[PDB]
From a paper:
Here, we discover an O-glycoside β-eliminase (OGE) from Agrobacterium tumefaciens that converts the C3-oxidized O-β-d-glucoside of phloretin (a plant-derived flavonoid) into the aglycone and the 2-hydroxy-3-keto-glycal elimination product. While unrelated in sequence, OGE is structurally homologous to, and shows effectively the same Mn2+ active site as, the C-glycoside deglycosylating enzyme (CGE) from a human intestinal bacterium implicated in β-elimination of 3-keto C-β-d-glucosides. We show that CGE catalyzes β-elimination of 3-keto O- and C-β-d-glucosides while OGE is specific for the O-glycoside substrate. Collectively, our study shows the convergent evolution of a β-eliminase active site for the cleavage of 3-keto O-β-d-glucosides in biological pathways of natural product deglycosylation.
The X-ray structure of AtOGE was determined to 2.0 Å resolution using molecular replacement based on a RoseTTAFold52 calculated ab initio model of the enzyme. A single AtOGE dimer is present in the asymmetric unit. Each subunit adopts a TIM barrel fold, comprised of eight centrally arranged β-strands and seven exterior α-helices. The dimer interface is formed by the α-helix α1 from each subunit. A 14-residue loop (Thr198−Gly211) between β-strand β7 and α-helix α7 as well as the C-terminal region (Leu236−Gln259) show low electron density and are only partially modeled. A metal ion, likely Mn2+ from the crystallization setup, is bound in a shallow cavity at the top entrance of the barrel. Despite the high similarity between the two chains in overall structure (root-mean-square deviation (RMSD): 0.221 Å), only one AtOGE subunit (β) adopts the metal on the position that is plausible for the substrate access. In the subunit β,it is coordinated by residues contributed from β-strands β5 (His132), β6 (Asp163), β7 (His189) as well as by a water molecule. Glu233 from β8 is weakly coordinating. The AtOGE central fold is highly similar to that of PuCGEα (RMSD: 1.230 Å) as well as homologous subunits of other CGEs.
Author numbering:
A (entry chain A): 1 to 199, 213 to 238
B (entry chain B): 5 to 42, 46 to 197, 212 to 235
Write the structure that this text describes.
């Protein structure tokens, strides 16, 4: 079970709701599962002060938050204000819609350089930055993945939220990929199929992750299709 | 091993809140099971199977158990619910002395025997009024002991502790007679010593941790 692993501390991906009453049930589940940290999605749906009061009550910490690229492009100052309203989360690029995906190696380089500029401004405001990949960043140009192109061009203020299932599915070894990102990994992300309860060669991946500097194993439960 | 699976007790729809939003929250929290409360079996089987969530318990009021039990059996089997749970007693239905709590346990034990012959199990969910004591014994122990082991406890540990009884120790008196632990979601993170409650619950044979939305 991924939740019973103890190489990396566990964090849960949590979808925020407008109703702070129903948000409390999600936090009570984490308390009983022994999970103390969350990565938030849609955090702006709820009032910051209401969410802060509930997190404090349940001793849960927001360790990162999904911020779409159009918000980083359109008003970064507002992103900074919104994220700091709840504390100190890593600002994480969650996904790229098809229309935002570069087409060639030079485009992926330019995109990483763009993100590196945001990472500098976020850093000046006291916020870190991460990038969460899926499958389209695994495309390769002359032997190098789009993901490595953009992270290398962005510089070490941008860390990887590495989705290792997509790394492996593309035919790259996840542990070796983590070696190339030594000191530039924020977390490992994985889908969790195990039912909630009280409390891919993971046996090599999680040690490689920890040696690279990963701080969190972020687990996600999905809606069925 | 040392984990209790978590189920959620469903709640009524207030404001705009839909039922499917309830199930979607549970999917995203990873909760695989629900305890239902008081819409047709056709409608709720369909939504539960589409969200891949099973019913593990259903709150059935005492007046239904007393009035039409064969109908209770039919309705529970229609949604695949395996456990009939008495959720509450209104003040007028609460026995007044030790003899009355014993007689009430015997009554419930008769329903548990009939439910068992129909292939269904039975549990009893307490609040605070069952924690009253007669010559050292709680009303809750009187009724469970008198009902026999076909009636199990859905033990509300907050009300046990609030009455001055250690919930871990109380679970020890109910070894093999505990269906679930019950708790609400509005409690601050550490009143209740979950470091002792959870192993006691597991040792006693609890099958579920059931979370109630205040
Ligand atoms: Mn992410
Ligand atoms: Mn490189
Ligand atoms: Mn209860």
């Amino acid at each position: 079970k991924l939740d019973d692993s103890k190489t990396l501390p566990i964090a849960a991906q949590m979808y925020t709701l407008r109703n702070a009453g129903t948000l409390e049930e999600q936090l009570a589940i984490l308390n009983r599962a022994g999970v103390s940290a969350v990565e938030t999605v849609d955090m702006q749906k709820v009032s910051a002060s209401e969410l802060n009061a509930l997190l404090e009550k349940h001793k849960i910490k927001v360790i990162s938050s999904h911020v779409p690229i159009d918000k980083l492009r359109g008003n970064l100052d507002e992103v900074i204000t919104e994220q700091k309203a709840v504390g100190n989360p890593v600002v994480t690029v969650p996904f790229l819609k098809p229309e935002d995906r570069p087409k060639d190696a030079a485009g992926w380089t330019a995109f990483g350089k763009e993100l590196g500029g945001y990472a500098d401004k976020l850093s000046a405001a006291g916020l870190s930055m991460a990038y969460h990949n899926h499958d389209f960043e695994m495309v390769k140009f002359d032997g190098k993945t789009a993901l490595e192109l953009l992270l290398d061009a962005a510089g070490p203020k941008l860390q990887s939220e590495l989705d290792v299932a997509w790394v492996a599915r593309s035919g790259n070894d996840p542990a070796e990929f983590l070696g190339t990102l030594n000191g530039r990994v924020f977390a490992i992300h994985a889908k969790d199929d195990a039912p909630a309860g009280t409390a891919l060669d993971w046996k090599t991946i999680l040690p490689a992750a920890k040696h690279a500097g990963a701080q969190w194993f972020i687990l996600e439960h999905d809606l069925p299709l």
